Design an enzyme around this catalytic site. Structure first.
Site, PDB file in Angstrom:
ATOM      1  N   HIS A   1      -6.247 -75.366  26.800  1.00 57.17           N
ATOM      2  CA  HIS A   1      -6.245 -76.689  25.893  1.00 57.17           C
ATOM      3  C   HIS A   1      -7.120 -77.678  26.705  1.00 57.17           C
ATOM      4  O   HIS A   1      -7.536 -77.668  27.854  1.00 57.17           O
ATOM      5  CB  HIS A   1      -4.895 -77.594  25.685  1.00 57.17           C
ATOM      6  CG  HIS A   1      -4.117 -77.417  26.948  1.00 57.17           C
ATOM      7  ND1 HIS A   1      -4.268 -78.448  27.954  1.00 57.17           N
ATOM      8  CD2 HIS A   1      -2.886 -76.975  27.136  1.00 57.17           C
ATOM      9  CE1 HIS A   1      -3.368 -78.017  28.986  1.00 57.17           C
ATOM     10  NE2 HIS A   1      -2.651 -77.037  28.587  1.00 57.17           N
TER      11      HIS A   1
ATOM     12  N   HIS B   1     -12.380 -80.869  29.927  1.00 55.47           N
ATOM     13  CA  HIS B   1     -12.662 -79.230  30.412  1.00 55.47           C
ATOM     14  C   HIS B   1     -11.558 -78.624  29.700  1.00 55.47           C
ATOM     15  O   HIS B   1     -10.386 -79.247  29.506  1.00 55.47           O
ATOM     16  CB  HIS B   1     -12.782 -79.277  31.801  1.00 55.47           C
ATOM     17  CG  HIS B   1     -11.293 -79.465  32.455  1.00 55.47           C
ATOM     18  ND1 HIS B   1     -10.958 -80.881  32.656  1.00 55.47           N
ATOM     19  CD2 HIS B   1     -10.504 -78.675  32.893  1.00 55.47           C
ATOM     20  CE1 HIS B   1      -9.788 -80.860  33.465  1.00 55.47           C
ATOM     21  NE2 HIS B   1      -9.274 -79.564  33.582  1.00 55.47           N
TER      22      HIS B   1
END
Length: 182
Positions: free
Chosen positions: A42, A127
């Site tokens: 995620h 990220h």
């Protein structure tokens, strides 16, 4: 013991067409690197380590308010990198970029703080974590990606501790209901 709290975090889910090429990149891992499972991938916007359950409704209202006027975000995979910047790397990640994503994370973090709810964040650098390690391992070669996806909403997750690692449960999702042309 004190009143129980929840470990929560706001994140963008990553769809199958993206977790699949990321997992293929994980086939290069070796040594002490531990790959993140695709179901665990995620883009985190804010991590809240100890939320009293009675505050969850405020957090759901905050999620709805901040997503109401944004369109679905177009998230682009970029290149890989490491945390921390120097020294033995402890995490391998792929960078992600989307118009509005830093602004959404910063508004969310300010809104959480305005609620008097604790966070445990570093400077925001969007990220997807691909692997973690403690101790030495062969360094991975630089990779870059060209895939992208459209994120329809923001998700509030709860993290629970299990033997195979953490497990994430969706608490609520907040749809991006806006547009970028009106």
């Amino acid at each position: 013991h004190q009143p129980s709290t929840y470990r929560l975090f706001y994140a963008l889910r990553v769809p199958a067409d993206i977790t699949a090429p990321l997992a293929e990149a994980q086939a290069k891992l070796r040594g002490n690197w531990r790959a993140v499972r695709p179901d665990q991938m995620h883009v985190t916007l804010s991590y809240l380590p100890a939320v009293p359950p009675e505050r969850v409704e405020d957090l759901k209202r905050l999620g709805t308010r901040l997503t109401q006027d944004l369109p679905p975000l177009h998230v682009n995979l970029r290149g890989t990198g490491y945390f921390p910047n120097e020294g033995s790397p402890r995490v391998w990640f792929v960078k992600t970029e989307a118009e509005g994503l830093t602004e959404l994370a910063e508004n969310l973090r300010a809104g959480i703080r305005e609620l008097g709810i604790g966070t445990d964040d570093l400077a925001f650098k969007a990220h997807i974590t691909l692997a973690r390690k403690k101790g030495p391992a062969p360094r991975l070669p630089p990779l870059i990606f060209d895939q992208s996806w459209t994120a329809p909403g923001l998700t509030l997750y709860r993290s629970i501790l299990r033997k195979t690692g953490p497990i994430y449960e969706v608490q609520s999702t907040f749809r991006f209901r806006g547009s970028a042309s009106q």
